[PDB]
Structures are given as C-alpha cells and as structure tokens.
Amino acid sequence: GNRKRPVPKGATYGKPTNQGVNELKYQRSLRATAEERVGRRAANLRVLNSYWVNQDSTYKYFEVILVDPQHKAIRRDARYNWICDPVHKHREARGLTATGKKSRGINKGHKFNNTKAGRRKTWKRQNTLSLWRYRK
C-alpha cells in the first residue's frame, strides 16, 4: 500500500498544496524496505541482492542474499573479497544495491539528466556561482 503521512488528525498546518494525506507514495520500493530490515537484523553480514517470491493482498514476500565478510571462505575468495572492504558497509542503507540504484535513477541517457550522477550533487553544481581570480 501507500505511505500515509504521519500527522495527527490529518492537520498539516500549511498551504493547501501540501494537505494531502492518503494518496502519497514512498519513494523507495517495498523490496528496498525488505533489505533494510534484514540488514539491521543481521548487522554482521553484507546485503548482496534480493528477489520477489510471493505476494498477497496484505504482504509482499522477498528473499535476501547475505554474505559473511568475516568468514575465511569469503576473505580468501578473489571474486568476492571486495565486499569485505569497509566502503561496502550497509549497501542497502545507501541505496547501492540493484533496487537502490533503480530508485535513485542511476542510468544513462537524456531520460536521467536530473539523476545521472546523484540528484543532489547535480543540483549543487548547477546552483553554484563560480568566480575566478581574473573575472570572466
């Protein structure tokens, strides 16, 4: 379902353009929410990927793939010891998984001008006044 705005009794205290309560949508997918809660449950592991398995009217079901960065079978494996690097801690929290990059709009082409290399970094670049020593 949708994400109801958590305001008391529906009052928003603002302009009518922001008075919506019921028809609002969460910007991350339910698949992303599944990975986050599994990630907190097993904080000694690293989230690799996840996939859809089932659904009903109330719930969607997913299975999350996890890799142990402390196990010697992983640290000695050349194809998977990249995950042991500290830069890959909590990938699902920062949206670095496959579902995370989809919701961030990390793709190529004219359709993704706003989010090619990070939406907020692009906004900073386009809203920055650049001055040189010899003014242009």
């Binding site: 006044l129 001055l131 020593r133 010899y134 003014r135």
Partner: protein, 103 residues
C-alpha cells in the same frame, strides 16, 4: 571573500607600459628625478662586460658594481633603513629601505 582582488589588463597595453618604462631608463633626467645617485656616471644607459654574468662571490660582485660607478646608489640603500610608521610592523613588514640598481 568574493570581493575582486586581481585586475585583468589587456596584454598589448601591458606591453606598452613595459616598453615605455624601458625607454625611460635611458633618460638621465628621469633617473635622477627618481632618486638614484647617477650624478657622476658619464653615459646612460650603462653597459658592462658579459663577464659580470659569471661572478660567483658576493665580494667580487660588489667590487664590479663599485668600479662602474654604482657605489653611491649602493650606499644610499644602506643608510636608508628605517622602522615602519604604523601597525604594519607586527604584520611582517617591519623595515623599509630604498631601491638600488637593477642588473
């Protein structure tokens, strides 16, 4: 901080000023008016031997300038050392002196 600090000057007009400055160095009236002690120097501009470029020691370099007539200008710099007259003394600008010859 985004106050303008550097000033852009046209390249050709910049060279115009440099050429005018070079020509003024050959006029004895202007050199004397700028405070240099060239009263007893016969010919302006002053050209010396190319052997000056190969001098290694300061003692002989001063002697070479001494023998060509720049002694009075060198002495003027030494006797003009003074303490600055304001708050610039404790901003790494403590002593002021004159300008000597340019080689």
């Amino acid at each position: 901080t985004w106050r303008k600090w550097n000033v852009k000057v046209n390249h050709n007009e910049k060279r115009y000023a440099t050429a005018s400055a070079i020509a003024a160095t050959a006029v004895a009236s202007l050199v004397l008016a700028r405070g240099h002690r060239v009263e007893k120097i016969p010919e302006i501009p002053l050209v010396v031997s190319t052997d000056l470029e190969s001098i290694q020691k300061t003692k002989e370099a001063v002697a070479a300038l001494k023998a060509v007539g720049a002694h009075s200008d060198l002495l003027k710099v030494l006797k003009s050392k003074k303490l600055r007259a304001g708050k610039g003394k404790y901003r790494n600008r403590r002593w002021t002196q004159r300008r000597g010859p340019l080689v």
